[PDB]
Amino acid sequence: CINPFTNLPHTPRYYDILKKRLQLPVWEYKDRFTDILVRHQSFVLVGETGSGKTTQIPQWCVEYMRSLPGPKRGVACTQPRRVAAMSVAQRVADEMDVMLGQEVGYSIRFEDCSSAKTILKYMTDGMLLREAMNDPLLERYGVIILDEAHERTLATDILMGVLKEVVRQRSDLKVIVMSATLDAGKFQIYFDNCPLLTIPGRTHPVEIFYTPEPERDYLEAAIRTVIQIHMCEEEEGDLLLFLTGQEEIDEACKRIKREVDDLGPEVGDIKIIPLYSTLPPQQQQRIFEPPPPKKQNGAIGRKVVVSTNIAETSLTIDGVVFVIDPGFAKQKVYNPRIRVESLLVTAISKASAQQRAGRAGRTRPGKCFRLYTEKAYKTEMQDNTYPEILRSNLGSVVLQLKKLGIDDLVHFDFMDPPAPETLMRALELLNYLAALNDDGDLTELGSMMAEFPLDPQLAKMVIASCDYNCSNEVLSITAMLSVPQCFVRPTEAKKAADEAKMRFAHIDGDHLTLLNVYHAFKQNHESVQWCYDNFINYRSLMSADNVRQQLSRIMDRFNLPRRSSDFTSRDYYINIRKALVTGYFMQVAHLERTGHYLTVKDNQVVQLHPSTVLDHKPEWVLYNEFVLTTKNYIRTCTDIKPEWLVKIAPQYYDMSNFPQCEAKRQLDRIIAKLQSKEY
Ligand SMILES: Nc1ncnc2c1ncn2[C@@H]1O[C@H](COP(=O)(O)OP(=O)(O)O)[C@@H](O)[C@H]1O
Numbered sequence: 273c274i275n276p277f278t279n280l281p282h283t284p285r286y287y288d289i290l291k292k293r294l295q296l297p298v299w300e301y302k303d304r305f306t307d308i309l310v311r312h313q314s315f316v317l318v319g320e321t322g323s324g325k326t327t328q329i330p331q332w333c334v335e336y337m338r339s340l341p342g343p344k345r346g347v348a349c350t351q352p353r354r355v356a357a358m359s360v361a362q363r364v365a366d367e368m369d370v371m372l373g374q375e376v377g378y379s380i381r382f383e384d385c386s387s388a389k390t391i392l393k394y395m396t397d398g399m400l401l402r403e404a405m406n407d408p409l410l411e412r413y414g415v416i417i418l419d420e421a422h423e424r425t426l427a428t429d430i431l432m433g434v435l436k437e438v439v440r441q442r443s444d445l446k447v448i449v450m451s452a453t454l455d456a457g458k459f460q461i462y463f464d465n466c467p468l469l470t471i472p473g474r475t476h477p478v479e480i481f482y483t484p485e486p487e488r489d490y491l492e493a494a495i496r497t498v499i500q501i502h503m504c505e506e507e508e509g510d511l512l513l514f515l516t517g518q519e520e521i522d523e524a525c526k527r528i529k530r531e532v533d534d535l536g537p538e539v540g541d542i543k544i545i546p547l548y549s550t551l552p553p554q555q556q557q558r559i560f561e562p563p564p565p566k567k568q569n570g571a572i573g574r575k576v577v578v579s580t581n582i583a584e585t586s587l588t589i590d591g592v593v594f595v596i597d598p599g600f601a602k603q604k605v606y607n608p609r610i611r612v613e614s615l616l617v618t619a620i621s622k623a624s625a626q627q628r629a630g631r632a633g634r635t636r637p638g639k640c641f642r643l644y645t646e647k648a649y650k651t652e653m654q655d656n657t658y659p660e661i662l663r664s665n666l667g668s669v670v671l672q673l674k675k676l677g678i679d680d681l682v683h684f685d686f687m688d689p690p691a692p693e694t695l696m697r698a699l700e701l702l703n704y705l706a707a708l709n710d711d712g713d714l715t716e717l718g719s720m721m722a723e724f725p726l727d728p729q730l731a732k733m734v735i736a737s738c739d740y741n742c743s744n745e746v747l748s749i750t751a752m753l754s755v756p757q758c759f760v761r762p763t764e765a766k767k768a769a770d771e772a773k774m775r776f777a778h779i780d781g782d783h784l785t786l787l788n789v790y791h792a793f794k795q796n797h798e799s800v801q802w803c804y805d806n807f808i809n810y811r812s813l814m815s816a817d818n819v820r821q822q823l824s825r826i827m828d829r830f831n832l833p834r835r836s837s838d839f840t841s842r843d844y845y846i847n848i849r850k851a852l853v854t855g856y857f858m859q860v861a862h863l864e865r866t867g868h869y870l871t872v873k874d875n876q877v878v879q880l881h882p883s884t885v886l887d888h889k890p891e892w893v894l895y896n897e898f899v900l901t902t903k904n905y906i907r908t909c910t911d912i913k914p915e916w917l918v919k920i921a922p923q924y925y926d927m928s929n930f931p932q933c934e935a936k937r938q939l940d941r942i943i944a945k946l947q948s949k950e951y
Pocket residue numbers: 296319320321322323324325326327328359360362363560585586587588590
């Protein structure tokens with residue numbers, strides 16, 4: 273029959289895919305799905321990964337929208353994960369026989385693939401909350417679906433609160449909450465005891481393996497699980513290994529590419545595939561590829577995917593029988609008393625481990641090779657990881673809620689309410705940035721900050737830089753800070769990489785070094801060869817350029833001038849460094865007489881991250897990032913003048929409320945000197 277959007281026949285592609293997708297677990301419940309949808313404003317849908325929730329259900333809601341009178345609106349389906357949203361959009365575009373970016377599309381922070389024609393949009397949970405800023409009832413959508421709500425991300429929880437208020441003012445909107453599990457909060461009690469639909473699992477049983485006692489270096493000891501699986505096992509099937517991020521991942525794909533062809537033609541081939549947050553579409557889509565063929569003589573031609581907890585629940589790779597679970601992941605941590613946010617590798621929950629093992633069972637029965645003991649699972653691990661709202665600084669969150677018109681914050685319906693101390697640190701942060709007044713009301717400046725898709729600190733820095741006549745350079749720095757690490761540092765060629773990085777070093781430090789990289793990238797015409805020559809990440813730089821363009825359009829909308837100072841003047845670099853202070857004045861460390869650094873209020877001993885270009889230890893350093901390892905590192909570091917701290921951020925540098933230390937004694941000396949009294 274006929275494609276309703278194109279008014280043409282559906283294609284050969286379309287029919288081949290329709291055939292396979294009708295067989296997905298979700299389809300036998302479509303009638304009862306439809307029957308709940310037409311009768312209720314909101315309900316919950318639970319089903320294991322691979323059951324067909326993300327691809328099929330939003331199509332059904334499109335079908336539903338096309339049944340309706342003429343207020344002709346979209347469907348939104350939120351993903352916690354960029355790679356999930358972008359790759360399902362491509363998949364669903366194919367399933368619906370449409371062009372990605374036309375009837376089906378996606379929206380990620382700085383990456384909008386959509387048009388006038390878009391009626392189904394796969395977006396991050398973060399982006400839908402962004403859209404609510406300018407459209408508080410989300411009138412562009414008739415159906416909104418929060419997918420992967422079991423991952424309890426910060427943006428997902430806030431969307432559940434928001435949408436629960438939206439449904440009281442809008443009768444025409446439908447909300448669906450989809451999840452892999454019934455745990456991670458109860459959802460239907462939250463949405464006023466609304467219907468539940470559960471899709472049975474087709475998990476081919478999975479043999480859970482362990483190790484005798486605690487493993488120390490799991491990277492190489494999970495490589496030795498990857499190898500022994502790719503010889504000892506006799507039937508076909510692909511491998512999925514859970515690492516914690518995109519260096520450790522790339523390590524294990526550089527490693528295990530010369531090895532394990534340590535071995536001639538004899539053993540079976542391996543198509544090795546990495547998966548992490550950053551990858552562009554054209555290379556996300558290689559997890560969906562057929563493994564290499566069987567050799568005439570030898571072993572199974574096999575596929576190994578090396579991946580973040582993106583593959584835990586957010587998608588399925590067909591072919592996977594063998595799952596290796598190191599049992600850690602890059603979480604977000606936040607002490608509300610230390611006031612330090614950082615990304616930390618840490619032990620997963622029983623919920624999570626069991627999810628990861630689940631992936632091995634999605635074709636035939638499989639084996640999960642968990643690299644722990646039963647004691648490090650049964651007795652030593654949590655049932656459920658804390659929902660992300662209890663592990664984050666809520667500065668951005670609070671600003672977004674205030675921009676959405678939410679005044680009283682304890683009188684706000686969180687599913688799991690945050691510790692009221694973390695809430696109050698967020699209010700203070702925002703008051704220090706002048707985003708909120710002393711009553712906690714949104715200022716004109718706060719309102720504007722909220723429409724930049726940036727941490728409040730960065731937003732304030734961009735806006736305030738106009739008054740230091742260096743908005744152009746601050747926008748470039750901001751864009752470099754908003755994309756992945758730009759310096760390629762192969763572990764086999766550290767001195768070479770470091771020396772290339774030094775070609776760009778500014779004497780006052782790393783922020784200006786990022787400005788130097790960006791300027792050099794542009795004046796060399798976005799050249800890939802230039803990037804290779806200088807060990808600069810071409811993808812990072814292309815991403816930065818795109819972020820800068822996006823941020824530029826926001827500046828134009830708000831009439832904030834995009835200006836530079838005179839490069840021949842000394843004020844050029846001074847002005848930019850003063851601008852950094854307007855946003856980062858709380859991220860400041862003082863050089864002690866001992867050669868250590870102590871963070872300004874919280875008195876934490878830190879050292880300059882070893883990747884810094886700084887030649888010397890500035891007396892005062894402003895930093896972008898606090899890195900928790902076995903040492904505290906401050907990363908992306910600039911030399912600043914303490915006088916700037918007093919002049920630009922007096923509310924924070926209030927000596928009546930400040931701990932005794934070398935920093936306070938210099939600061940008091942500076943404050944007395946400004947006042948030039950002889951009492
Ligand atoms: N991007 C893609 N490319 C090719 N095939 C896919 C893609 N995404 C999903 N599939 C296939 O279609 C199925 C649909 O699964 P999905 O809707 O993602 O399930 P759930 O969201 O419930 O985990 C998968 O099991 C897989 O076999």
